[PDB]
Design a protein around this ligand. Structure first.
Ligand SMILES: Nc1ncnc2c1ncn2[C@@H]1O[C@H](COP(=O)(O)OP(=O)(O)OP(=O)(O)O)[C@@H](O)[C@H]1O
Ligand SMILES: Nc1ncnc2c1ncn2[C@@H]1O[C@H](COP(=O)(O)OP(=O)(O)OP(=O)(O)O)[C@@H](O)[C@H]1O
Ligand SMILES: O=P(O)(O)OC[C@H]1O[C@H](OP(=O)(O)OP(=O)(O)O)[C@H](O)[C@@H]1O
Ligand SMILES: O=P(O)(O)OC[C@H]1O[C@H](OP(=O)(O)OP(=O)(O)O)[C@H](O)[C@@H]1O
Ligand SMILES: [Mg+2]
Ligand SMILES: [Mg+2]
Lengths: 207, 207
């Protein structure tokens, strides 16, 4: 059958309506289980629950035939060995730069504190800046408060996180939504299983 | 004053008794707050709550003067630009290799699924193996079930996680406890503040 890689929180929550419309429901709540492999109402489809970071890794190697990944994670991971088939328009946010509100930029090479080191470098390169990048894994909004780095790059949605910590978004880098990715082989070998799920999602997202 | 980097869960929980003995208590529970900078009973000491991965990063750059980091995270991060001053003997576990119980090793170059790619490489190198490493961020115990990689490297404590997923530990790599690390400059510049806290911890750990 098909293995679908998802992640907890917004992607699991916001994907389920798309799955339900396509004839696929989980038989329990993965948020409440230690389990990581879940059957569905469709015995041709099961689900993996992974860290957001690992969804492309699983789909690339074909541990999963397909997954739902944030565009931020694909941009950072590189998506050269998976096919991006659909923009699902869920878990919508922005990649942004940010700093202490009204904090002047220092006139030296910039230090960007981010999980998204490759996106930070590419974005600053497009703005004419070779920056240094301090790699972190969470709570990017702490970095500028303690003077770790001049700016951060992170996902902004409401901007509540930035505002609460006295930060403000400086640049918008790009819009981020979750994307349906397929294993390059799975697409060739199990398309008959993928296709009616792809067509259902495509129709669902139009609404 | 001094900034102490800690992380949530076991390290925060198991460090607090050491801090209390040294005259330092948090004025609230960081597990229940969105906040990330916490004053203490000691107005010369405040606390950062970070991802475990980021504690050395903060201490290295001196965003934090000192922190409590797992030895697994120091080994993987490299600890060449911090001083390891004490083995606190908390959050004790092992770095181990593991696979499907009784699964034979394939007679090709090995694929290790781990967060600890540098530890995996070093350990397999000491065993005469140049392995490939599939980088992941969590739920290492899923990898072998779906045939992502031949083995995993991960922290084992009770082994409950391995057993529940039908995995077994193959090799013990090394013992892991949390370590007190200092910024190389903070050690030189604020030793008068560090010393009585260091002496208290050292005494505490003897018991
Ligand atoms: N506030 C938000 N609103 C909407 N979408 C978001 C928001 N924050 C993140 N996302 C999107 O959701 C994806 C996954 O979010 P999630 O919180 O699971 O990631 P994470 O912080 O890396 O998780 P982990 O704790 O496993 O590292 C992101 O990669 C991004 O595309
Ligand atoms: N089961 C365990 N028993 C004891 N110590 C543990 C156990 N698991 C991990 N540790 C130790 O605790 C440290 C931090 O644990 P924690 O669970 O916060 O890490 P993590 O999974 O990277 O967290 P995050 O979700 O932020 O990525 C580890 O680096 C290790 O030294
Ligand atoms: O702009 P806002 O609406 O404040 O949202 C932005 C935040 O949302 C996400 O946090 P999440 O809830 O996933 O916490 P975590 O990812 O740090 O665990 C993300 O990590 C951002 O920090
Ligand atoms: O050998 P055991 O006693 O089963 O412990 C080992 C597990 O403990 C930790 O999990 P944690 O509770 O930190 O979950 P997480 O790190 O995967 O979030 C670690 O990630 C190991 O998987
Ligand atoms: Mg998150
Ligand atoms: Mg953990």
């Amino acid at each position: 059958g098909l293995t679908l890689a998802l992640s907890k929180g917004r992607i699991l929550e916001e994907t389920m309506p798309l799955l339900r419309a396509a004839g696929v429901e989980l038989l329990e709540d993965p948020e409440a289980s230690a389990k990581l492999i879940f059957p569905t109402s469709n015995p041709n489809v099961r689900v993996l629950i992974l860290r957001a970071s690992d969804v492309p890794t699983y789909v690339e190697h074909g541990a999963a035939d397909f997954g739902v990944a944030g565009k931020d994670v694909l941009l950072e991971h590189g998506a050269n060995h998976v096919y991006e088939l659909l923009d699902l328009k869920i878990a919508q946010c922005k990649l942004m730069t940010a700093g202490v509100k009204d904090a002047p930029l220092p006139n030296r090479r910039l230090r960007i504190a981010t999980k998204y080191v490759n996106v930070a470098r590419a974005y600053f390169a497009s703005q004419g800046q070779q920056v240094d990048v301090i790699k972190l894994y969470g709570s990017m909004e702490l970095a500028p408060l303690v003077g770790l780095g001049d700016l951060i790059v992170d996902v902004v949605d409401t901007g509540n996180t930035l505002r609460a910590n006295g930060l403000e978004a400086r640049d918008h880098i790009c819009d981020v939504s979750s994307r349906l990715i397929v294993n390059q082989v799975s697409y060739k070998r199990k398309f008959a299983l993928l296709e009616p799920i792809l067509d259902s999602f495509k129709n669902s997202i139009n609404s």
